[PDB]
């Protein structure tokens, strides 16, 4: 298979607007949401149909209890950060954990925290230490690193358990996650040439323009890979035409091991 990843996010908000949850937690496999929990529902629920069909009620009930606990821990930690920053108002706390299983069989694992959307603490599971970005994080780093067993626990989870979960979910959702839908690609001019692709899955795609068989990335406008809403994606890239000299332009698209070239007459 190609590269896949599993990650869980947590969001905490210290003084949210009424109705807006103080805590949200969402899991993803690749770009697909799989799980959700918040402080309003107080329930962990599936966000993909192949998760609901393959995980028994005891799974959702157990993690519902753990997430109620994790919700409280997040509030306490955010309260401590905002006090040590001496910040008034509403501020945010975020966590991301997960792992990648790469095409060549190697793995990665990551765990990090953010305050107000900026990196705060970043775990290094090889040196078993926390990288702090400022003195508030430095205070937390000291406390967390004093609990050596917890660092070892996180290394084991990232390297063994997380990859096991990922393989389990990849099999559950194999009909969605392991399929290939090739792009439909077309060129037009609006002067500049636009190369547009749509209808493809997975979302990873590379589009570029070549001039007389040469690539110059600083002359190309790259569009974002965007969801179309039906499970497929679309993207584009553009380049401006030199009206003073003749040149052969070509759009090149690489997707899921297939290369396409569209030569402009």
């Amino acid at each position: 298979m190609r590269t896949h990843s599993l990650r869980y996010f947590r969001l905490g908000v210290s003084d949210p607007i009424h109705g807006v949850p103080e805590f949200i937690s969402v899991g993803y496999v690749d770009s697909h949401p799989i799980t959700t929990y918040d402080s309003v529902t107080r329930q962990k629920e599936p966000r993909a149909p192949w998760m609901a069909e393959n995980l028994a009620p005891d799974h959702w009930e157990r993690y519902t209890q753990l997430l109620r606990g994790w919700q409280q821990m997040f509030k306490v930690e955010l309260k401590r950060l905002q006090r040590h920053y001496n910040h008034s108002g509403s501020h945010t706390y975020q966590r991301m954990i997960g792992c990648e299983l790469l095409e060549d069989g190697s793995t990665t694992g990551f765990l990090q925290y953010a305050y107000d959307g900026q990196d705060f603490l970043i775990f290094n599971k090889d040196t078993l230490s926390w990288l702090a970005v400022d003195n508030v994080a430095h205070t937390i780093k000291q406390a967390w690193e004093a609990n050596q067993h917890e660092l070892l626990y996180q290394k084991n989870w990232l390297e063994e358990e997380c990859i096991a979960w990922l393989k389990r979910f990849l099999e559950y959702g194999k009909d969605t996650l392991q399929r290939t839908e090739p792009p439909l690609v077309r060129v037009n001019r609006k002067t500049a040439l636009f190369c547009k692709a749509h209808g493809f899955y997975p979302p990873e795609i590379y589009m570029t323009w070549m001039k007389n068989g040469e690539e110059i990335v600083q002359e190309i406008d790259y569009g974002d890979i965007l969801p179309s809403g039906d499970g497929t994606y679309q993207a584009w890239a553009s380049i401006e035409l030199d009206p003073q000299s003749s040149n052969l332009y070509s759009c090149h698209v690489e997707h899921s091991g297939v290369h396409m070239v569209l030569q402009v007459p």
Partner: antibody
Framework: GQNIDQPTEMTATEGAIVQINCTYQ??????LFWYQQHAGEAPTFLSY??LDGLEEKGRFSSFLSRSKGYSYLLLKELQMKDSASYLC??????????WGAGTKLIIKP | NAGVTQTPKFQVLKTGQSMTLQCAQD?????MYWYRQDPGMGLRLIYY???????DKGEVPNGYNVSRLNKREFSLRLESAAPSQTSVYFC??????????????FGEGSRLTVLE
């Protein structure tokens, strides 16, 4: 099914060394604990292992092999006060503890 | 600075009698647990409370109920005692949820004998 096995009873001599074994088959692994429980008293925490290897804490050491699903608790220079039950417990993939039935350690003076 | 305080240490009951076991912890712990211990088997979880304001069943919840009254207290109720509930009951707590390397802290135990 998830299972954890340890011998029911062991007898050793004062001053000697004893190794208490614990084997486990679980759905996932998030660490192995040893607890001491004197007769008629509460269990108390002794040790935690989650990566492979040996960890020492006084006269007690704890070893873990994740690939073999095996741990031992090593007691050196046995004293009469080491007479107790020793409980092994493993956290599974959903962080639920599975408890062994305990090993009663009897020490001959 | 008392740790985990549970009561009573001993209790005899007649079949059908009600009983509440009390447990409090003063360590500012978030998760609390009720276990039973019986000869020849490992500890079995009855009910647990991952955090203040939530509880859920363990492995052997039938015949029991719990109340997480506040952050400190987690009581165990036997509404109609049965001879099979003769056992030694342990309350325990940990700093946070069962997720992580954190150990359990146990109360002294409550020995119950239920007689016809």
């Amino acid at each position: 099914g998830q299972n954890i096995d340890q011998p029911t009873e062991m007898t050793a001599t004062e001053g000697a060394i004893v190794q208490i074994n614990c084997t486990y088959q679980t759905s996932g692994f998030n660490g192995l604990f040893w607890y001491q429980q004197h007769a008629g008293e509460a269990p108390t925490f002794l040790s935690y292992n989650v990566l492979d290897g040996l960890e020492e804490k006084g006269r007690f050491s704890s070893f873990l092999s994740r690939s073999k699903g095996y741990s031992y608790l090593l007691l050196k220079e046995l004293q009469m006060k080491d007479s107790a039950s020793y409980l092994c417990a493993v956290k599974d993939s959903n962080y639920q503890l599975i408890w062994g039935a305990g090993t009663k350690l009897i020490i001959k003076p | 600075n008392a740790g985990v305080t549970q009561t009573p240490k001993f209790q005899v009951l007649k079949t059908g009698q009600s009983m509440t076991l009390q447990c409090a912890q003063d360590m500012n712990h978030n998760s609390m647990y009720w276990y039973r211990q019986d000869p020849g088997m490992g500890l079995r979880l009855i009910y647990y409370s991952a955090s203040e304001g939530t509880t859920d069943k363990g492995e052997v919840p039938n015949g029991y109920n719990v109340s997480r009254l506040n952050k400190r207290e987690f009581s165990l109720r036997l509404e109609s005692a049965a001879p099979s509930q003769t056992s030694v009951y342990f309350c325990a707590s940990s700093v946070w949820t069962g997720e992580g390397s954190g150990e359990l802290f146990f109360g002294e135990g409550s020995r119950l004998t239920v007689l016809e």
